[PDB]
Amino acid sequence: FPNSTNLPRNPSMADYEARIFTFGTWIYSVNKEQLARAGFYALGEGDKVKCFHCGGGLTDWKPSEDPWEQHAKWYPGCKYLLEQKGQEYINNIHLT
Ligand SMILES: C=N[C@@H](CC)C(=O)N[C@H]1/C=C\CC[C@H]2CC[C@@H](C(=O)NC(c3ccccc3)c3ccccc3)N2C1=O
Numbered sequence: 001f002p003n004s005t006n007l008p009r010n011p012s013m014a015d016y017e018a019r020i021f022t023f024g025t026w027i028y029s030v031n032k033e034q035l036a037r038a039g040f041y042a043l044g045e046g047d048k049v050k051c052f053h054c055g056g057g058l059t060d061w062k063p064s065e066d067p068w069e070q071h072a073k074w075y076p077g078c079k080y081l082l083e084q085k086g087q088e089y090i091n092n093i094h095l096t
């Protein structure tokens with residue numbers, strides 16, 4: 001179950017630097033900057049990633065798909081998400 005509290009499930013991955021580093025060998029076309037910025041880091045197996053905060057896992061990405069958009073699509077309850085895009089952003093992802 002994703003995290004809903006305000007405590008990062010993976011503290012060691014709270015820095016864009018820490019995270020971005022995991023995409024060192026990334027062979028996929030999904031933009032690793034956006035992924036890291038959206039709060040994800042690579043698990044080194046396939047195109048699987050997780051949110052350092054809510055700890056939600058995402059995989060099987062399509063070319064055009066947007067990290068922030070996805071992160072909100074599947075894990076709305078995430079706080080790190082809430083803090084960067086705000087409730088309004090989220091609500092309109094699900095209502096529309
Ligand atoms: C096309 N588009 C992509 C765009 C990101 C996509 O929609 N992928 C998801 C599609 C699949 C199924 C539903 C969903 C539900 C959320 C995850 C789940 O499947 N994540 C897994 C997982 C595995 C076992 C138990 C729980 C979750 C996961 C785990 C760790 C790292 C990466 C992925 N989900 C996805 O990743």
Ligand SMILES: [Zn+2]
Binds near residue numbers: 075
């Ligand atoms: Zn999250």
